[PDB]
Symmetry: C3
Subunit: 401 residues, 3 copies
């Protein structure tokens, strides 16, 4: 009959349509809602928006950094501009008196470490799953805001805390004093001053460095702020199926052991400033020298701004393959109640007015022992291609007998 010619014509033609499918390298995305007996609680990094406490700024610091913080002009004088408070201008005309004064050596990293807000003074109260925690439970981390702190860091081999139930009771609750009376006076616009009072916060996997100035959320004074979270786990496929970049212990990055958009970007930033400024900012990795006030103002602040705003050539940062995202729903209530104000004032030896202006509470917790997963899977595996081609080859071989 015609059947052996028309069985070879259809087999070899349909066989090359299951090979044109494979070589397109399709993927398919599986969504799931996994019920979880327990979840790993994330890292919570948090920063005061004020970088330098006024009371920690020495004559020597003012001498070196005063122009960078717009407290001095280029002539080491307190400016013509009377943005100053009367009582503040007295304290500062003193510090800014440089007659007979001999400069001592100065280091931006030291200054940040010494003058940065102290978690020990800021942290009025802290609880996790009902257990008390202290300033010892927060590891120091440097960010563009300066001396910041990470709760449940996972760093120093201490074990990562876990959430076993839904609701606020199985989460973090911290009361802070943002210390507005230590806020450095703002007499000019710079990258180191802000118009704002409160803290920046980032909730992130322990495996990701914080990127708090770009990806953080804000928490205001005078409110208890509830943050209800949801763990989202995302898997992506490498080339040729997608564009992602393996998360392993061989990062392939100058300054990081594991790949992450954040690590990739901090790497790229650090490289760029070292190349163009011959220094790194106090928060960047490597062993390059720390920038001086002059270098911050003249080279580094502008360069870093140029980089994260304009330049699109220098920073090529691809998706990681493993990635953990946190959905957040914020809500707030006022603190303090008219009733509670006097108790809080007395409990902390502050004015009632001060409590209103400086106290906040932050509750971070999960809605439900559940994570969304969104995994990209290979559409048509190479194994399953030879398991069709094996069965295509087996019946045209059964047509010859």
């Amino acid at each position: 009959a015609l059947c052996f010619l028309g069985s070879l014509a259809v087999l070899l033609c349909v066989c090359t349509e299951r090979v044109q499918y494979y070589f397109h390298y399709h993927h398919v995305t599986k969504l799931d809602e996994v019920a979880a007996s327990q979840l790993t609680f994330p890292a919570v990094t948090l920063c005061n928006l004020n970088e330098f406490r006024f009371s920690q700024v020495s004559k020597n610091d003012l001498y070196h950094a005063g122009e960078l913080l717009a407290l001095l002009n280029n002539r080491y004088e307190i400016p013509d501009t009377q943005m100053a408070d009367e009582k503040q201008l007295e304290i500062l005309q003193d510090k800014a008196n440089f007659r007979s004064f001999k400069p001592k050596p100065f280091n931006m990293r030291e200054f940040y470490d010494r003058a940065g807000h102290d978690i020990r003074d800021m942290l009025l109260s802290c609880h996790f799953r009902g257990e008390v925690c202290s300033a010892e439970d927060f590891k120091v981390v440097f960010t563009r805001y300066g001396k910041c702190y990470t709760f449940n860091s996972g760093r120093d081999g201490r074990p990562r805390l876990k959430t076993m139930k839904g609701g606020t009771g199985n989460g973090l609750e911290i009361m802070l004093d943002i210390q507005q009376d230590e806020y450095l006076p703002v007499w000019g616009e710079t990258d180191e001053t802000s118009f704002e009072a409160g803290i920046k916060v980032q909730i992130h996997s322990q495996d990701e460095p914080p990127f708090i100035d770009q990806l953080g959320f804000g928490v205001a004074p005078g409110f208890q702020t509830f943050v209800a979270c949801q763990e989202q786990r995302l898997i992506y496929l490498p080339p040729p199926w997608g564009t992602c970049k393996a998360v392993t212990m061989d990062s392939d990055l100058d300054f990081f052991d594991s790949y992450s958009i954040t690590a990739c970007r901090i790497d790229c930033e650090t490289r760029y400033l070292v190349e163009n400024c011959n220094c790194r900012m106090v928060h960047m990795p490597g062993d390059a020298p720390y920038c001086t006030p002059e270098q911050y103002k003249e080279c580094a602040d502008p360069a870093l701004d140029f980089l994260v705003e304009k330049d699109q050539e220098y920073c090529v940062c691809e998706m990681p393959c493993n990635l953990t995202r946190y959905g957040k729903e914020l809500s707030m209530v006022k603190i303090p109640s008219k009733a509670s104000a006097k108790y809080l004032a007395k409990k902390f030896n502050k004015s009632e007015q001060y409590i209103g202006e400086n106290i906040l509470v932050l509750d971070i917790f999960f809605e439900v022992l559940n994570y969304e997963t969104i995994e990209q899977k290979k559409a048509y595996e190479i194994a399953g291609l030879l398991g069709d081609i094996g069965g295509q080859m087996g019946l045209f071989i059964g047509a010859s007998i």
Copy 2:
């Protein structure tokens, strides 16, 4: 040979037959996501609670005598404490009520106290509209929670029909103006489970088939703001063992004190059991027929026990996912109230000071972004019916090949 082209035909069906049985016995599932365009949505329940549990003006000498220690207004010696964290004018009203010379205790009930001294929705609710229809205090059913006397709008309880949203946007939702009544806030002289540092309300948006769990799962709304809450209905289906870990939701709940299964119901059940076992009482907000805890039992046994339970213990409370489950995505945003312009009008309209309006008025708009719910349904991967429809057709061609040769 011609019988061997048959022997390679039998080896393939018996081998592939036990690979489609090893697949079935793995009990795989597959998850279908969908974005159904909806003519109509059932508007959820909205439970809301003042953060202040007891109005100061409702606390009698008898109440202060029994509960004063629990609310840190008294020490264990029925005296106003050493530490003068009191306001001068406030302390005057209380010196009187706290005078217990000659006084004989009269009978006292935590449930009654909560009911009598709790904020009245009738006094709190300055204004309320749903899809442009007016509603009053009559539209809010009373419910007891750890915060005390709370209220649920669109409860579905008392056979009243569940309200529906037919368009997106704020205009087809709830808008309520409240006065949180800070001047009735019980003075806070010490830390307890019944006092808070905060003013405002807690709110929970939830299915009518869920009891509220407002202290754990609620969101906050502050005074001095209009707060927009833009919602999205999410419907989740899960598969029971052996495919998953869920426990079917029907009207045969299988729970001591509840109509339908829900993590919330399951947890309140488990909490009620635990306190009865370890305290020989229930809290005013728990179901069952056990006696209500006394202030003494609240302070000594129940408050610490319930805290122990929801914080530390992971032995006692095994509460599994329901199979049917309704979630609400929310985006909150706010504007200031009142404007400098509106302040005098609101003061006059409600016979309050301008300062008072600033401190006590809030507006809440709850509404849906779009006539749409997300569904996320787990479906059985390989049904048992479709297994007999493969193994019957696997068995039927080699029995067709042995009949020929």
Copy 3:
């Protein structure tokens, strides 16, 4: 044998089960996260909550609109209710003196345009991806709130701005003065007055008109407000697979180029008011006459409220098939810090108290170079039905070859 009796019965039976599947018209929904080198930054429309600046309300305006703004009663005189500010009641008793006064002609649209807050006065500062922008980067748009503004409108052939990187640095940051001292005094409840200070904001596709009073979010004075966004792209299938309405070269709407729930609704609203009131509101399209204060109060305000609240018959607006959604996470910090207050006061020649009451900052930006897609795809295509019927027709033609 019995094989030809059993083999045509199985073709015809399986054939009509794969035709009962097709005629059910199933669909399947594909979810994805695509890694994006770049995204189109959306439109950002924003409105002051105060519709008419006090200082722009002329004697002529008060004469025509005073009742609509509850500054006059139905006898076009100032009410005797002593619930004005003392100094405001003076300025207004003056304006409200109509002895000797000759009416000049009046237009709600002109009034809105003239008395609406000026983006040029409100916009203290504005940056996108670090580049400076001015009042000229915001196109005027009329909404129920009145004179509003859209950033990155895409209108007037200007090109749509793009986001290249995640985080606040690659987004919009605007500092506003909401001008509370220009807020029209509230002596009564109407659809044009509000109890609230701040702005309403909507983030939306450039292809969608804003629907800011219904679908907007609020931004309060005295805070920097971070809005972190996520682009969600939704595809739906038309009947018989679903209920959507394909976006074409013919919008199918009297007054819009492209279909969109928002366009569809504004269309339907415009039709309804013209039919029932013989006017349109200043923010509606078409060529109908603009409503007068009297028409606003008596017919149009109540009609539009009736429409968006109660009526369920008149406005049949079905899902578009192509559709862009923006997930948002808001957070805020206080402005100004005790430290910054005097600098801001001096920089803008305002009191320190004023700064607290009127200044806000808004940052709109994307968390990650990623959009979620949710595409409905046809379950069983009509092509693939003839490719199964062709393979069942091929083996009983192999069974009639034997017999």
